[PDB]
Amino acid sequence: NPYVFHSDRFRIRASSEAGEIRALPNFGEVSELLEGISRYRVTCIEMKPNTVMLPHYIDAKWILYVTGGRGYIAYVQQNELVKRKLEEGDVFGVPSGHTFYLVNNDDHNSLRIASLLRTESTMRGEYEPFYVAGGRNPETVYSAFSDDVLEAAFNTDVQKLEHIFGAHRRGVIFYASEQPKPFNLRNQKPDFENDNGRFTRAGPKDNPFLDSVDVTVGFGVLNPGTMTAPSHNTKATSIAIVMEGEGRIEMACPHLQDINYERVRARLRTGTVYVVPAGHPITEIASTNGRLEILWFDINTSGNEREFLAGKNNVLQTLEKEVRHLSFNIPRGEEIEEVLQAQKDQVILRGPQRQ
Amino acid sequence: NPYVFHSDRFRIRASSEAGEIRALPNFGEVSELLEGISRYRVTCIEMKPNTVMLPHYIDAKWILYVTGGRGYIAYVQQNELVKRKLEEGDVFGVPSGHTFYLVNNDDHNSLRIASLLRTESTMRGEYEPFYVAGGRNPETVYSAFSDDVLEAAFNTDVQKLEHIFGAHRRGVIFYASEQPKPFNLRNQKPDFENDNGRFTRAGPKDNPFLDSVDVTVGFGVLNPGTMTAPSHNTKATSIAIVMEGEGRIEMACPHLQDINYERVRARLRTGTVYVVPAGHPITEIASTNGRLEILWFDINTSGNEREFLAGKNNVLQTLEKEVRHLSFNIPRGEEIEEVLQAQKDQVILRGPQRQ
Amino acid sequence: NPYVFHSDRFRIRASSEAGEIRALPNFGEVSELLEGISRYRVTCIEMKPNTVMLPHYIDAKWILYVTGGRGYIAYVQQNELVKRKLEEGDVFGVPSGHTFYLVNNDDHNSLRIASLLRTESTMRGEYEPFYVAGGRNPETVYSAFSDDVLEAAFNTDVQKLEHIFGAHRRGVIFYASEQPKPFNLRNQKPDFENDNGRFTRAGPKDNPFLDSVDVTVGFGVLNPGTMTAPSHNTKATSIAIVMEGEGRIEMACPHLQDINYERVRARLRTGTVYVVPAGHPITEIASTNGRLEILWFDINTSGNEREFLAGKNNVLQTLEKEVRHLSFNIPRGEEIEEVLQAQKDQVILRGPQRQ
Ligand SMILES: [Cu+2]
Ligand SMILES: [Cu+2]
Ligand SMILES: [Cu+2]
Secondary structure, three states: OOOEEOHHHOEEEEEOOOEEEEEOOOHHHHOHHHHHHOOEEEEEEEEOOOEEEOOEEEOEEEEEEEEEOEEEEEEEOOOOEEEEEEEOOEEEEEOOOOOEEEEEOOOOOOEEEEEEEEEOOOOOOOOOEEEOOOOOOOOOHHHHOOHHHHHHHHOOOHHHHHOOOOOOOOOOEEEOOOOOOOEEHHHHOOOEEOOOEEEEEEOOOOOHHHHHHOEEEEEEEEOOOEEEOOEEEOOOEEEEEEEEOOEEEEEEEOOOOOOOOEEEEEEEOOOOEEEEOOOOOEEEEEOOOOOEEEEEEEEOOOOOOEEEOOOOOOHHHOOOHHHHHHHHOOOOOOHHHHHHOOOOOOOEEEOHHHO | OOOEEOHHHOEEEEEOOOEEEEEOOOHHHHOHHHHHHOOEEEEEEEEOOOEEEOOEEEOEEEEEEEEEOEEEEEEEOOOOEEEEEEEOOEEEEEOOOOOEEEEEOOOOOOEEEEEEEEEOOOOOOOOOEEEOOOOOOOOOHHHHOOHHHHHHHHOOOHHHHHOOOOOOOOOOEEEOOOOOOOEEHHHHOOOEEOOOEEEEEEOOOOOHHHHHHOEEEEEEEEOOOEEEOOEEEOOOEEEEEEEEOOEEEEEEEOOOOOOOOEEEEEEEOOOOEEEEOOOOOEEEEEOOOOOEEEEEEEEOOOOOOEEEOOOOOOHHHOOOHHHHHHHHOOOOOOHHHHHHOOOOOOOEEEOHHHO | OOOEEOHHHOEEEEEOOOEEEEEOOOHHHHOHHHHHHOOEEEEEEEEOOOEEEOOEEEOEEEEEEEEEOEEEEEEEOOOOEEEEEEEOOEEEEEOOOOOEEEEEOOOOOOEEEEEEEEEOOOOOOOOOEEEOOOOOOOOOHHHHOOHHHHHHHHOOOHHHHHOOOOOOOOOOEEEOOOOOOOEEHHHHOOOEEOOOEEEEEEOOOOOHHHHHHOEEEEEEEEOOOEEEOOEEEOOOEEEEEEEEOOEEEEEEEOOOOOOOOEEEEEEEOOOOEEEEOOOOOEEEEEOOOOOEEEEEEEEOOOOOOEEEOOOOOOHHHOOOHHHHHHHHOOOOOOHHHHHHOOOOOOOEEEOHHHO
């Protein structure tokens, strides 16, 4: 399956005792069907209590979502330190190339972050970390410069420098203004709610950073035994990450003479990532065991809307009656009208195992 | 020839007794010389009298031009039906991913549409139709979902659903607000007219949709035995479609040590498509049999102008006299000035067979 | 080395006795590590005294910098000739597809121009000249059209035309409004100056043309025995051209399991071009023989800033003291604070051979 990435697909970028940094591979190298979002990367960050991450920068724009825990982030912006507290449900952006670090000063809860990267390198989809604080593990960018250059740059003998750039081996994650603020997404829950679930969205019109990358961030909850009404985005491509719970998906894909839609089926568990290309109708079904929590990013979100194939607000009811009659061509009269009004909910519906 | 596509190059996407949908292949797969417009696709639609097209959507932005007939289009926009009458010469846009249908309620005239698509899929140049009304021919996207999902989605037993999503086999085309309005292009004819022809243009400053895709649409008529003055676009790439009549083209292409311009020659007949890359000078010559009618789309139209190589307004007359003298280097004095003023027309001239 | 281009890499596009046109190859064909700037091309122009360049146009946007000499440029804009004097240090832009020519009317000094091109063709990175004045050397675009077309276009017999389009063999360069004005960059020198060097920048907010291509142009001078403080751009990619003098560079590149930064070393001499991808820290060291003069273009310049790794304004001093302490992990207390304040200069420092 080119569209569904289970947690075992994540490659480790940094592994220590105090934390982990995982990243899904370049989308463009997995399939040709995903080449149009090859510029975007998905990463996860886990930081144990009482930890700090090494100051570094990446050659990529960075949208983060805090899935669990609390702490703070600090990045460098024009000889000033921008410091912001992070909390569960926070969405925040770090400009590309800006030296940053994260701190988890909680005594019992891990800090967990899910992120979308947008590369700004000369290679599409490729990003690299540049550590500016460090030691042997990992090495810093200072390790690439000759001794004469470094001695001249810092105006100190190399021995004092080697003593400074070689005393850290505890890894990337280790045990101890007027710039934008984090926006708590998982807070608000205004956007849609019925008896079966809810979701919340933050877009370009809510935050200057999301606007600069044309991304909408969403967080949804499906109650046990419920399903999203089959629906599609008009122009946005979605990257979804399962936060909690379990379930499955069904997606229709005409790419996988006559017109034919293939069935994309997959299981959903914690850490599962799936990609919904623009126009592809999908339904997410939640298990009866527990609720389904899903975070998602909409790429190319400007002007995007969602059209529903079933439910109280489906597109079929919006078509003229005659056309609907002709297109399905039924002798029975308005049997179609009876069927179209059987579903009393919209957007989020009762599932198969709870009809 | 990588630049000229005769009507036999069009592949059939849908063929029935009441209508046809044809599409030229991906430009990027024909030649490397066209990779920069690989995102754009050319389609044609013919609908017999008293016909309706199945409601569906495509993962692409859609600029249509009505070449012949009248009828109407309807697309779905936020639980509202946007319905607009279409007439010969109308230009209209349908947003990507929006469910639409076309109707030809005329009793004697076919509805014929020529279109430029701009893909919004994850694959550049590839677009697919998603039928939401239908049956076995064609199948709908509903056919990809399991029975339990569908039964739950619609809240009806599958037997009533199969009876609804299986009674249509007559094909894609069959016998029976405050949103934008179609703009009639073939109407106005203000833009240029002399004794030999005329043309009309609609661009980003005339219509919000054309502005969002940066396209100018043009319609031109060449009288029998006339030619366009050899000329080039500064930055726009043109995709031209022959509406009526016959003729030929000559184009200079340096791609096909020393500087050398190859001669791109081709015959023009009804349904011929040709591509003029930016900077490539071209002349269109009309046969003596009849007039030449041409529709065209300018890609990357913002800031684009046309420079003429011959005729009353050519670039050579704008150069300083001395430079013009030096560059051609002639002993005869101002023989160049005599030659440059021999042509009394501009833009559209008398052809070879009527000098 | 994929990042460093010595003068022998330039291919000759036009060679005569009165001048030369050189161009570096497509960046995208040299390495995959440069694919993201494959749309940009670097060219050099030398014109002897009392020379004129043949009127032509290219399918590319053109930013020029005059490295040496004086003269003027003229391009065609809507039946008007835009004529502008050029002087050493001038930056000017020519819109793509606009017929232009250059003149060197100086009696003793050559006119030398260094340029960044941004292609507007259907092939990324490829540009071609279209000569409209000419002869056998080079041929014009008129040479691609048939005799009947040309005779009809100009309304003159072909013999008079062949006598006009065949009398020039002296090559591309030969011996004799309210539109934008050239902006002298090498003039101002406000932007930064200390005891070791200076630099000057012109960006999108200073000039409408630079804004349309999102490029900043810079000119810097390093005194003998000095170095730039190791630093990186946040998001811009730089293309640098050595104007005068000699020296070397050291660049850290993580592309060339564990995190590892490779050392990119190269020699700098006149005509050396080097590319600094976004995020890559670099230092330029000037020889003790003479000063180092460098011209550079910043691609994707909007929102870009520079962060310094050493010197009075380095990023390490901006980090919180504790984090800096933890990250380098030193028993010695604030030995880091002593080392960080040893360098009293910023941006441009004393080199290795003059500590
Ligand atoms: Cu698909
Ligand atoms: Cu060509
Ligand atoms: Cu690198």
